[PDB]
Design a protein around this nucleic acid. Structure first.
Lengths: 222, 218
DNA sequence: TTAGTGTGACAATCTAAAAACTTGTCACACTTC
DNA sequence: GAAGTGTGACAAGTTTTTAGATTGTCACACTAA
Protein backbone atom coordinates (compact mmCIF):
# COMPACT_ATOMS: atom_id res chain seq x y z
CA UNK A 1 0.00 0.00 0.00
CA UNK A 2 1.64 3.24 1.21
CA UNK A 3 5.35 2.81 1.88
CA UNK A 4 5.69 6.33 3.42
CA UNK A 5 3.59 4.76 6.17
CA UNK A 6 5.56 1.53 6.39
CA UNK A 7 8.42 3.91 6.90
CA UNK A 8 6.92 5.82 9.78
CA UNK A 9 6.50 2.65 11.86
CA UNK A 10 10.07 1.96 10.92
CA UNK A 11 10.96 4.96 13.15
CA UNK A 12 11.88 5.54 16.76
CA UNK A 13 9.00 6.77 18.90
CA UNK A 14 10.37 10.18 19.81
CA UNK A 15 10.97 10.46 16.05
CA UNK A 16 7.43 9.73 14.93
CA UNK A 17 6.40 12.05 17.74
CA UNK A 18 8.51 14.79 16.17
CA UNK A 19 6.79 14.11 12.84
CA UNK A 20 3.44 14.88 14.51
CA UNK A 21 4.42 18.49 15.06
CA UNK A 22 5.27 18.96 11.42
CA UNK A 23 1.88 17.48 10.58
CA UNK A 24 -0.02 19.26 13.32
CA UNK A 25 1.36 22.43 11.74
CA UNK A 26 0.20 21.30 8.30
CA UNK A 27 -3.24 22.08 9.73
CA UNK A 28 6.28 24.80 2.43
CA UNK A 29 9.88 23.95 3.30
CA UNK A 30 11.98 25.03 6.33
CA UNK A 31 10.53 24.58 9.84
CA UNK A 32 12.11 24.90 13.30
CA UNK A 33 11.31 22.36 16.01
CA UNK A 34 9.44 24.24 18.73
CA UNK A 35 10.45 22.55 22.00
CA UNK A 36 7.72 24.36 23.95
CA UNK A 37 4.98 23.14 21.62
CA UNK A 38 6.40 19.61 21.77
CA UNK A 39 6.89 19.69 25.55
CA UNK A 40 3.23 20.37 26.25
CA UNK A 41 1.86 18.28 23.37
CA UNK A 42 3.31 15.26 25.20
CA UNK A 43 3.16 16.59 28.76
CA UNK A 44 6.80 17.40 29.32
CA UNK A 45 9.43 19.81 30.51
CA UNK A 46 11.37 21.62 27.79
CA UNK A 47 14.38 20.21 29.57
CA UNK A 48 13.27 16.73 28.53
CA UNK A 49 11.51 17.70 25.29
CA UNK A 50 14.82 19.18 24.42
CA UNK A 51 16.86 16.06 25.05
CA UNK A 52 14.43 13.81 23.14
CA UNK A 53 14.16 16.15 20.15
CA UNK A 54 17.94 16.22 20.01
CA UNK A 55 18.41 12.45 19.94
CA UNK A 56 15.50 11.88 17.55
CA UNK A 57 16.91 14.36 15.04
CA UNK A 58 20.39 12.78 15.31
CA UNK A 59 18.87 9.28 14.96
CA UNK A 60 17.04 10.57 11.90
CA UNK A 61 20.45 10.70 10.27
CA UNK A 62 20.98 8.56 7.18
CA UNK A 63 17.27 7.73 6.75
CA UNK A 64 14.96 7.68 3.74
CA UNK A 65 11.59 6.58 2.34
CA UNK A 66 11.46 4.03 -0.47
CA UNK A 67 8.71 3.97 -3.01
CA UNK A 68 8.96 0.69 -4.86
CA UNK A 69 8.24 0.43 -8.56
CA UNK A 70 6.79 -2.28 -10.83
CA UNK A 71 7.14 -1.14 -14.48
CA UNK A 72 10.55 0.43 -13.94
CA UNK A 73 11.85 -3.04 -13.13
CA UNK A 74 12.62 -6.19 -15.05
CA UNK A 75 13.86 -9.63 -14.08
CA UNK A 76 14.88 -10.80 -10.60
CA UNK A 77 15.54 -7.11 -9.90
CA UNK A 78 12.94 -4.67 -8.53
CA UNK A 79 13.05 -0.96 -9.30
CA UNK A 80 12.54 1.97 -6.95
CA UNK A 81 12.93 5.63 -6.05
CA UNK A 82 14.21 6.61 -2.58
CA UNK A 83 14.15 9.88 -0.55
CA UNK A 84 15.71 11.06 2.74
CA UNK A 85 13.29 12.43 5.38
CA UNK A 86 15.11 15.73 5.65
CA UNK A 87 16.95 17.55 2.83
CA UNK A 88 18.67 19.47 5.62
CA UNK A 89 18.80 19.22 9.41
CA UNK A 90 20.85 20.91 12.14
CA UNK A 91 21.24 21.79 15.83
CA UNK A 92 22.88 24.66 17.68
CA UNK A 93 23.08 24.49 21.46
CA UNK A 94 24.33 28.10 21.37
CA UNK A 95 21.07 29.59 20.08
CA UNK A 96 19.26 26.59 21.60
CA UNK A 97 17.52 26.07 18.25
CA UNK A 98 16.85 22.87 16.25
CA UNK A 99 16.35 23.36 12.47
CA UNK A 100 15.16 20.91 9.81
CA UNK A 101 14.47 21.29 6.11
CA UNK A 102 11.79 18.78 5.18
CA UNK A 103 12.48 17.20 1.82
CA UNK A 104 9.74 18.51 -0.47
CA UNK A 105 9.22 15.36 -2.57
CA UNK A 106 7.76 13.84 0.63
CA UNK A 107 5.69 16.69 2.19
CA UNK A 108 2.64 15.82 -0.01
CA UNK A 109 2.12 12.52 1.84
CA UNK A 110 2.21 13.86 5.40
CA UNK A 111 -1.48 14.78 5.40
CA UNK A 112 -1.84 10.98 5.17
CA UNK A 113 -0.21 10.41 8.54
CA UNK A 114 -2.71 12.24 10.75
CA UNK A 115 -5.37 9.66 9.88
CA UNK A 116 -2.74 7.34 11.28
CA UNK A 117 -1.31 9.31 14.15
CA UNK A 118 -4.88 9.38 15.44
CA UNK A 119 -6.71 6.17 14.59
CA UNK A 120 -3.73 3.90 15.18
CA UNK A 121 -1.96 6.12 17.78
CA UNK A 122 1.34 5.98 15.90
CA UNK A 123 3.09 8.50 18.10
CA UNK A 124 3.52 5.81 20.73
CA UNK A 125 4.86 2.87 18.76
CA UNK A 126 8.37 1.50 19.00
CA UNK A 127 10.44 0.67 15.91
CA UNK A 128 8.56 -1.76 13.66
CA UNK A 129 10.05 -3.06 10.42
CA UNK A 130 7.73 -6.03 9.79
CA UNK A 131 5.45 -4.81 6.97
CA UNK A 132 3.08 -7.61 7.99
CA UNK A 133 2.99 -6.83 11.68
CA UNK A 134 2.01 -3.30 10.65
CA UNK A 135 -0.68 -4.42 8.30
CA UNK A 136 -2.19 -6.85 10.82
CA UNK A 137 -2.01 -4.12 13.49
CA UNK A 138 -3.98 -1.57 11.50
CA UNK A 139 -6.57 -4.22 10.69
CA UNK A 140 -7.09 -5.35 14.29
CA UNK A 141 -7.23 -1.73 15.49
CA UNK A 142 -9.91 -1.16 12.88
CA UNK A 143 -12.16 -3.22 15.15
CA UNK A 144 -11.54 -1.36 18.38
CA UNK A 145 -14.38 -0.09 20.53
CA UNK A 146 -14.22 2.99 22.80
CA UNK A 147 -13.05 0.53 25.47
CA UNK A 148 -9.70 0.01 23.84
CA UNK A 149 -10.44 -3.70 23.46
CA UNK A 150 -11.79 -6.28 21.05
CA UNK A 151 -12.27 -9.66 19.44
CA UNK A 152 -12.28 -10.22 15.70
CA UNK A 153 -12.11 -13.37 13.58
CA UNK A 154 -10.26 -13.28 10.29
CA UNK A 155 -10.13 -16.03 7.66
CA UNK A 156 -6.60 -17.33 6.95
CA UNK A 157 -7.04 -17.15 3.20
CA UNK A 158 -8.22 -13.59 3.74
CA UNK A 159 -5.21 -12.75 5.86
CA UNK A 160 -2.61 -14.22 3.50
CA UNK A 161 -4.29 -11.88 1.02
CA UNK A 162 -4.79 -8.33 2.31
CA UNK A 163 -1.38 -8.78 3.89
CA UNK A 164 0.15 -10.11 0.62
CA UNK A 165 2.12 -12.87 2.36
CA UNK A 166 4.62 -15.21 0.70
CA UNK A 167 3.17 -18.41 -0.78
CA UNK A 168 5.21 -20.70 1.50
CA UNK A 169 3.19 -19.41 4.43
CA UNK A 170 0.07 -21.01 2.98
CA UNK A 171 1.44 -24.17 4.65
CA UNK A 172 -0.05 -23.50 8.10
CA UNK A 173 2.96 -24.58 10.27
CA UNK A 174 5.07 -21.84 8.64
CA UNK A 175 2.20 -19.38 8.77
CA UNK A 176 2.51 -20.00 12.53
CA UNK A 177 6.10 -19.22 13.39
CA UNK A 178 6.66 -16.86 10.53
CA UNK A 179 3.61 -14.65 10.70
CA UNK A 180 1.23 -15.28 13.66
CA UNK A 181 3.68 -15.94 16.47
CA UNK A 182 6.09 -13.23 15.17
CA UNK A 183 3.54 -10.48 14.63
CA UNK A 184 1.29 -11.01 17.61
CA UNK A 185 4.48 -11.04 19.70
CA UNK A 186 5.52 -7.87 17.87
CA UNK A 187 2.32 -5.99 18.58
CA UNK A 188 2.95 -6.64 22.27
CA UNK A 189 6.51 -5.50 22.16
CA UNK A 190 6.04 -2.29 20.16
CA UNK A 191 2.46 -1.04 20.08
CA UNK A 192 0.15 -0.24 23.03
CA UNK A 193 -2.04 -3.19 22.06
CA UNK A 194 -2.11 -6.61 23.77
CA UNK A 195 -2.82 -9.62 21.58
CA UNK A 196 -4.05 -13.12 22.25
CA UNK A 197 -5.24 -15.57 19.64
CA UNK A 198 -6.90 -18.94 19.14
CA UNK A 199 -6.92 -21.22 16.12
CA UNK A 200 -10.52 -22.07 15.14
CA UNK A 201 -10.49 -25.19 12.94
CA UNK A 202 -13.37 -26.85 11.06
CA UNK A 203 -12.14 -30.42 11.16
CA UNK A 204 -8.38 -30.96 11.07
CA UNK A 205 -7.53 -28.01 8.83
CA UNK A 206 -7.48 -24.80 10.83
CA UNK A 207 -9.72 -22.19 9.24
CA UNK A 208 -9.62 -18.89 11.13
CA UNK A 209 -7.60 -16.95 13.69
CA UNK A 210 -9.54 -15.21 16.43
CA UNK A 211 -7.71 -12.35 18.01
CA UNK A 212 -8.63 -10.53 21.21
CA UNK A 213 -6.84 -7.30 21.95
CA UNK A 214 -7.18 -4.60 24.55
CA UNK A 215 -5.46 -1.26 25.27
CA UNK A 216 -2.45 -1.86 27.47
CA UNK A 217 -2.66 1.73 28.64
CA UNK A 218 -5.96 0.97 30.38
CA UNK A 219 -4.76 -2.33 31.87
CA UNK A 220 -3.44 -2.92 35.38
CA UNK A 221 -1.70 -6.26 35.01
CA UNK A 222 0.78 -8.23 32.91
CA UNK B 1 38.93 26.84 -1.83
CA UNK B 2 38.56 24.10 0.80
CA UNK B 3 35.94 22.73 3.24
CA UNK B 4 34.05 19.75 4.68
CA UNK B 5 32.40 18.43 1.53
CA UNK B 6 35.93 18.72 0.16
CA UNK B 7 37.99 16.74 2.69
CA UNK B 8 34.78 14.74 2.89
CA UNK B 9 35.36 13.30 -0.57
CA UNK B 10 38.79 11.92 0.31
CA UNK B 11 36.94 9.26 2.36
CA UNK B 12 34.67 8.11 -0.47
CA UNK B 13 35.28 4.58 -1.76
CA UNK B 14 36.92 3.94 -5.16
CA UNK B 15 33.46 3.11 -6.36
CA UNK B 16 31.87 6.20 -4.97
CA UNK B 17 34.80 8.25 -6.26
CA UNK B 18 34.29 6.58 -9.61
CA UNK B 19 30.74 7.80 -9.42
CA UNK B 20 31.38 11.22 -7.94
CA UNK B 21 33.19 11.90 -11.20
CA UNK B 22 30.50 11.03 -13.73
CA UNK B 23 28.54 13.43 -11.55
CA UNK B 24 31.04 16.29 -11.23
CA UNK B 25 31.20 16.27 -15.01
CA UNK B 26 27.59 17.35 -15.33
CA UNK B 27 27.19 19.35 -12.07
CA UNK B 28 19.10 21.20 -12.18
CA UNK B 29 21.40 19.15 -9.97
CA UNK B 30 20.38 15.80 -11.43
CA UNK B 31 22.37 12.84 -12.76
CA UNK B 32 21.72 9.68 -14.69
CA UNK B 33 23.94 6.63 -15.02
CA UNK B 34 23.48 3.79 -17.52
CA UNK B 35 24.98 0.55 -16.17
CA UNK B 36 26.16 -0.28 -19.67
CA UNK B 37 27.86 2.90 -20.84
CA UNK B 38 29.37 2.75 -17.36
CA UNK B 39 30.38 -0.97 -17.32
CA UNK B 40 32.13 -0.45 -20.70
CA UNK B 41 34.24 2.27 -19.16
CA UNK B 42 35.33 0.09 -16.29
CA UNK B 43 35.47 -3.32 -17.94
CA UNK B 44 32.86 -4.88 -15.69
CA UNK B 45 29.91 -7.05 -16.69
CA UNK B 46 26.73 -5.15 -17.38
CA UNK B 47 25.37 -6.42 -14.04
CA UNK B 48 28.67 -6.39 -12.21
CA UNK B 49 28.17 -2.65 -12.40
CA UNK B 50 24.65 -2.48 -10.97
CA UNK B 51 26.00 -4.29 -7.95
CA UNK B 52 28.91 -1.80 -7.65
CA UNK B 53 26.62 1.13 -8.41
CA UNK B 54 23.90 0.48 -5.83
CA UNK B 55 26.43 -0.67 -3.26
CA UNK B 56 28.18 2.71 -3.15
CA UNK B 57 25.06 4.70 -3.88
CA UNK B 58 23.80 3.10 -0.65
CA UNK B 59 26.95 4.04 1.28
CA UNK B 60 26.37 7.50 -0.23
CA UNK B 61 23.01 7.82 1.54
CA UNK B 62 23.49 7.02 5.18
CA UNK B 63 26.85 8.81 5.34
CA UNK B 64 25.33 12.30 5.26
CA UNK B 65 27.58 15.37 4.73
CA UNK B 66 27.88 17.39 7.89
CA UNK B 67 29.36 20.76 8.75
CA UNK B 68 30.42 20.85 12.41
CA UNK B 69 30.10 24.23 14.14
CA UNK B 70 32.67 24.83 16.90
CA UNK B 71 31.37 28.25 17.84
CA UNK B 72 27.67 27.45 17.65
CA UNK B 73 27.88 24.77 20.30
CA UNK B 74 27.59 24.78 24.07
CA UNK B 75 28.19 22.26 26.84
CA UNK B 76 29.00 18.67 25.92
CA UNK B 77 26.86 19.38 22.82
CA UNK B 78 28.53 20.14 19.47
CA UNK B 79 26.62 22.22 16.94
CA UNK B 80 25.96 20.99 13.41
CA UNK B 81 24.26 21.41 10.09
CA UNK B 82 23.91 18.13 8.15
CA UNK B 83 22.78 17.32 4.60
CA UNK B 84 22.32 13.96 2.89
CA UNK B 85 24.17 13.62 -0.43
CA UNK B 86 20.97 13.20 -2.43
CA UNK B 87 17.39 14.44 -2.38
CA UNK B 88 16.05 11.77 -4.63
CA UNK B 89 17.77 8.59 -5.66
CA UNK B 90 16.60 5.78 -7.95
CA UNK B 91 17.18 2.75 -10.17
CA UNK B 92 14.89 1.35 -12.86
CA UNK B 93 16.48 -1.88 -14.16
CA UNK B 94 13.74 -1.97 -16.82
CA UNK B 95 15.84 0.83 -18.30
CA UNK B 96 19.15 -0.31 -16.74
CA UNK B 97 19.78 3.21 -15.46
CA UNK B 98 20.39 4.77 -12.04
CA UNK B 99 19.15 8.34 -11.51
CA UNK B 100 20.12 10.73 -8.72
CA UNK B 101 19.41 14.30 -7.57
CA UNK B 102 22.17 16.03 -5.66
CA UNK B 103 20.94 17.75 -2.53
CA UNK B 104 20.49 21.33 -3.70
CA UNK B 105 22.28 22.42 -0.49
CA UNK B 106 25.39 20.66 -1.71
CA UNK B 107 25.18 21.80 -5.32
CA UNK B 108 27.02 25.06 -4.63
CA UNK B 109 29.98 23.30 -3.01
CA UNK B 110 30.59 21.26 -6.16
CA UNK B 111 32.23 24.23 -7.93
CA UNK B 112 35.38 23.69 -5.87
CA UNK B 113 34.73 19.98 -5.52
CA UNK B 114 35.45 19.93 -9.25
CA UNK B 115 38.54 21.94 -8.45
CA UNK B 116 39.61 18.80 -6.53
CA UNK B 117 40.11 16.13 -9.22
CA UNK B 118 41.40 19.05 -11.25
CA UNK B 119 44.21 20.63 -9.22
CA UNK B 120 44.58 18.03 -6.51
CA UNK B 121 44.00 14.97 -8.68
CA UNK B 122 41.48 13.39 -6.32
CA UNK B 123 40.43 10.84 -8.90
CA UNK B 124 43.74 9.11 -8.19
CA UNK B 125 43.49 9.34 -4.44
CA UNK B 126 43.07 6.17 -2.48
CA UNK B 127 40.71 6.43 0.52
CA UNK B 128 41.66 8.80 3.31
CA UNK B 129 39.98 9.48 6.63
CA UNK B 130 42.56 11.74 8.30
CA UNK B 131 41.87 15.44 7.58
CA UNK B 132 45.22 16.56 8.91
CA UNK B 133 46.77 14.19 6.43
CA UNK B 134 44.67 15.59 3.61
CA UNK B 135 45.40 19.17 4.68
CA UNK B 136 49.16 18.83 4.73
CA UNK B 137 48.58 17.16 1.37
CA UNK B 138 46.63 19.96 -0.25
CA UNK B 139 49.32 22.40 0.92
CA UNK B 140 52.50 20.82 -0.42
CA UNK B 141 50.71 20.17 -3.72
CA UNK B 142 50.19 23.93 -4.08
CA UNK B 143 53.93 24.25 -4.56
CA UNK B 144 54.13 21.76 -7.43
CA UNK B 145 56.76 22.14 -10.17
CA UNK B 146 57.25 21.30 -13.85
CA UNK B 147 58.24 17.76 -12.90
CA UNK B 148 55.71 18.14 -10.11
CA UNK B 149 58.22 17.65 -7.30
CA UNK B 150 59.47 20.25 -4.87
CA UNK B 151 60.86 21.13 -1.47
CA UNK B 152 58.97 23.27 1.05
CA UNK B 153 59.94 24.55 4.48
CA UNK B 154 57.01 25.32 6.74
CA UNK B 155 56.80 26.78 10.22
CA UNK B 156 55.73 24.23 12.82
CA UNK B 157 53.51 26.78 14.47
CA UNK B 158 52.09 27.54 11.01
CA UNK B 159 51.45 23.93 10.11
CA UNK B 160 49.34 24.00 13.25
CA UNK B 161 47.08 26.99 13.12
CA UNK B 162 46.71 26.45 9.34
CA UNK B 163 45.65 22.83 9.97
CA UNK B 164 43.89 23.39 13.29
CA UNK B 165 45.97 20.64 14.88
CA UNK B 166 44.96 19.89 18.50
CA UNK B 167 46.71 21.82 21.27
CA UNK B 168 48.34 18.74 22.80
CA UNK B 169 50.17 18.70 19.47
CA UNK B 170 52.41 21.72 20.01
CA UNK B 171 54.70 19.38 21.96
CA UNK B 172 57.31 17.94 19.55
CA UNK B 173 57.34 14.33 20.74
CA UNK B 174 53.66 13.67 20.12
CA UNK B 175 53.63 15.99 17.08
CA UNK B 176 55.85 13.44 15.40
CA UNK B 177 54.05 10.24 16.52
CA UNK B 178 50.53 11.49 15.79
CA UNK B 179 50.73 14.08 13.01
CA UNK B 180 53.97 13.83 11.04
CA UNK B 181 54.81 10.10 10.85
CA UNK B 182 51.09 9.31 10.48
CA UNK B 183 49.94 11.83 7.89
CA UNK B 184 53.20 11.57 5.94
CA UNK B 185 52.76 7.84 5.75
CA UNK B 186 49.07 8.04 4.83
CA UNK B 187 50.08 10.10 1.79
CA UNK B 188 53.05 8.16 0.51
CA UNK B 189 50.59 5.25 0.30
CA UNK B 190 47.30 6.79 -0.82
CA UNK B 191 48.17 9.59 -3.26
CA UNK B 192 50.52 10.14 -6.19
CA UNK B 193 53.27 11.75 -4.09
CA UNK B 194 56.38 10.53 -2.26
CA UNK B 195 56.62 12.67 0.87
CA UNK B 196 60.09 13.16 2.44
CA UNK B 197 60.57 15.17 5.66
CA UNK B 198 63.56 16.87 7.38
CA UNK B 199 63.14 18.92 10.57
CA UNK B 200 65.38 21.95 11.18
CA UNK B 201 66.11 22.56 14.86
CA UNK B 202 68.16 25.57 15.88
CA UNK B 203 69.95 23.92 18.76
CA UNK B 204 67.38 22.84 21.27
CA UNK B 205 64.06 23.92 19.67
CA UNK B 206 62.88 22.80 16.23
CA UNK B 207 61.03 25.31 14.08
CA UNK B 208 60.76 24.40 10.43
CA UNK B 209 60.19 21.09 8.61
CA UNK B 210 61.59 20.43 5.12
CA UNK B 211 58.98 18.54 3.10
CA UNK B 212 60.48 17.24 -0.14
CA UNK B 213 57.80 15.66 -2.31
CA UNK B 214 57.87 14.30 -5.86
CA UNK B 215 55.21 13.15 -8.32
CA UNK B 216 55.58 9.38 -8.60
CA UNK B 217 53.02 8.80 -11.36
CA UNK B 218 54.69 10.75 -14.16
C1' DT C 1 71.45 22.38 34.23
C1' DT C 2 67.50 22.22 31.09
C1' DA C 3 64.83 22.59 27.54
C1' DG C 4 63.89 18.80 24.32
C1' DT C 5 63.17 13.54 22.69
C1' DG C 6 61.28 8.26 22.50
C1' DT C 7 57.93 5.64 24.65
C1' DG C 8 54.08 3.41 27.61
C1' DA C 9 49.30 4.49 29.59
C1' DC C 10 44.47 5.74 29.53
C1' DA C 11 39.97 7.46 28.23
C1' DA C 12 37.38 8.17 23.99
C1' DT C 13 36.50 7.50 19.30
C1' DC C 14 35.88 5.21 14.93
C1' DT C 15 35.91 0.60 12.37
C1' DA C 16 36.32 -3.59 10.41
C1' DA C 17 35.23 -8.46 11.24
C1' DA C 18 32.43 -11.45 13.56
C1' DA C 19 28.82 -14.11 15.81
C1' DA C 20 23.89 -13.66 15.69
C1' DC C 21 19.40 -13.03 13.94
C1' DT C 22 15.47 -12.63 9.82
C1' DT C 23 12.67 -14.21 5.77
C1' DG C 24 11.23 -17.54 2.59
C1' DT C 25 10.98 -22.40 1.63
C1' DC C 26 11.48 -27.23 2.31
C1' DA C 27 12.12 -31.98 3.46
C1' DC C 28 11.91 -34.81 7.48
C1' DA C 29 9.69 -37.73 10.79
C1' DC C 30 6.08 -38.44 13.34
C1' DT C 31 0.33 -38.42 15.02
C1' DT C 32 -4.75 -38.38 13.67
C1' DC C 33 -8.88 -40.66 12.38
C1' DG D 1 -4.03 -43.47 4.28
C1' DA D 2 -4.80 -38.37 3.37
C1' DA D 3 -3.72 -34.33 6.14
C1' DG D 4 -2.07 -31.74 9.60
C1' DT D 5 1.89 -30.49 12.64
C1' DG D 6 6.25 -29.11 14.89
C1' DT D 7 11.27 -28.84 14.22
C1' DG D 8 15.81 -28.73 11.78
C1' DA D 9 18.39 -26.71 7.62
C1' DC D 10 19.28 -23.16 4.41
C1' DA D 11 20.48 -19.50 1.05
C1' DA D 12 20.18 -14.52 1.31
C1' DG D 13 19.98 -10.63 4.04
C1' DT D 14 20.34 -7.70 7.87
C1' DT D 15 21.88 -6.37 12.55
C1' DT D 16 24.11 -6.20 16.78
C1' DT D 17 28.35 -7.41 19.05
C1' DT D 18 33.32 -7.99 19.65
C1' DA D 19 37.69 -6.93 19.22
C1' DG D 20 40.85 -3.76 16.97
C1' DA D 21 42.70 0.14 15.72
C1' DT D 22 42.71 5.74 16.05
C1' DT D 23 42.97 10.13 18.41
C1' DG D 24 43.76 13.59 22.02
C1' DT D 25 46.68 14.02 26.34
C1' DC D 26 50.07 13.26 29.80
C1' DA D 27 53.10 12.01 33.78
C1' DC D 28 57.78 9.57 33.06
C1' DA D 29 62.54 8.00 32.61
C1' DC D 30 65.90 9.99 29.63
C1' DT D 31 70.19 12.12 26.30
C1' DA D 32 72.82 16.21 24.45
C1' DA D 33 74.55 21.06 26.04
Amino acid sequence: SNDLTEAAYSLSRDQKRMLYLFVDQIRDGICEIHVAKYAEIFGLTSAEASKDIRQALKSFAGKEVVFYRPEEDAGDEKGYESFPWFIKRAHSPSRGLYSVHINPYLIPFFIGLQNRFTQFRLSETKEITNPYAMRLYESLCQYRKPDGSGIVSLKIDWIIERYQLPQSYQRMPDFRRRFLQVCVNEINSRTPMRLSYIEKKKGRQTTHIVFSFRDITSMTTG
